[PDB]
């Protein structure tokens, strides 16, 4: 018990008690810094499903990002008209992945495992990010995570091996439609996505 | 100078010997500027042998 009720409360905040708590919490979170370590997760069901254990070596961080798309700098040389746009552009990475990269940048000895949405403003989105210390003995002893101290797993978030990166690389499709995403985007001349 | 002869002795004799050899090397380098033109080389290499053996005696 006790996990389904959290799930059901967060399935639609407006329709429950979570809306008002989030309004107050946002009032406070807007004062905080962009990246901030916290003690306990806000959504425990979602964290423990993406992999979170109450042990030494697990760290939780909250990250604030600005909403919307991107605006390109003005071209200084001559351009053709199809090449002139500035204002209506979107990033090919998602805001989740961008938040994870910010957290990674501020904690240089840890590795990102996953992340989850924790609220929205008119100006801002908030995500919570789970990190692991690979060189801690508890971690090196628990065999559900002990893979994370291998050579091939540093820079994980920067190379796109977290779940948000996989989604933005198109690796949740398998058959018809997915011809140009496997094994890499670079492998098919950048032509997917 | 040979390492067997250097390994029979005590660190204090080794130290006295380094002092003496350094003084000789300075004197010879002074006259050189004025019969065995290899004295300087052999003195250098002897000082080196002594320092090696002293270090290995201490590390024990």
């Amino acid at each position: 018990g006790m996990y389904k009720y959290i799930r059901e409360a967060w399935k639609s905040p407006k329709k429950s008690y979570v809306g008002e708590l989030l309004k107050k919490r946002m009032i406070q979170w807007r004062r905080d810094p962009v990246v901030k370590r916290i003690e306990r997760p806000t959504r425990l069901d979602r964290a423990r499903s993406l992999g979170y254990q109450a042990k030494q070596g697990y760290v939780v961080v909250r990250v604030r990002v600005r909403r919307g798309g991107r605006k390109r700098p003005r071209w200084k040389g001559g351009r053709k008209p199809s090449k002139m746009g500035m204002v209506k552009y979107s990033p090919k990475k998602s805001l989740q992945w961008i938040a994870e990269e910010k957290a990674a940048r501020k904690f240089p000895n840890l590795e990102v495992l996953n992340s989850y949405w924790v609220g929205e403003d008119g100006m801002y989105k908030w995500f919570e990010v789970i990190m692991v210390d690979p060189h801690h003995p508890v971690i090196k002893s628990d065999p559900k995570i002990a893979w994370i101290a291998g050579k091939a797993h540093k820079g994980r978030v920067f190379r796109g091996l977290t779940s948000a990166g996989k989604r933005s690389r198109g690796l949740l499709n398998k058959g018809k439609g997915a011809e140009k995403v496997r094994p890499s985007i670079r492998a098919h001349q950048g032509k997917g996505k | 100078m040979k390492p067997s002869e250097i390994r029979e002795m005590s660190i204090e004799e080794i130290d006295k010997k380094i002092r003496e050899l350094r003084l000789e090397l300075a004197k010879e380098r002074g006259v050189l500027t004025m019969e065995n033109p290899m004295v300087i080389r052999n003195l250098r290499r002897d000082i080196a042998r002594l320092l090696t053996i002293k270090r290995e005696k201490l590390r024990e």
Binding site: - | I18, R19, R22, L23, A26, K27, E28, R29, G30, V31, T33, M34
Partner: protein, 85 residues
């Protein structure tokens, strides 16, 4: 600096010999990284004399030259004879 590691050469030139026999002074080529205290101690321990004054210069061959004045109770010429010259 460790004494017995400071002195590299004595000098024997016209200027140096003049200073020996006129001002009770010796002249040595010395390690670049040595100070005047170190030079004083080196000379005093290697030759068992007492020192009055040390002066220094860096040459344009990259070497340090030291001029050492002993106290008048000791003669620079006896140490000069103890050295090669």
């Amino acid at each position: 600096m460790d004494p017995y590691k400071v002195i590299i050469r004595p000098l024997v030139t016209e200027k140096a010999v003049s200073l020996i026999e006129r001002e009770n002074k010796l002249t040595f080529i010395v390690d670049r990284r040595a100070t005047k205290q170190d030079i004083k101690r080196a000379v005093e321990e290697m030759f068992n004399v007492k020192v009055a004054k040390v002066n220094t210069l860096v040459t344009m061959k990259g070497e340090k030259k030291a001029y050492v004045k002993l106290k008048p109770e000791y003669d620079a010429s006896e140490i000069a004879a103890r050295l090669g010259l």
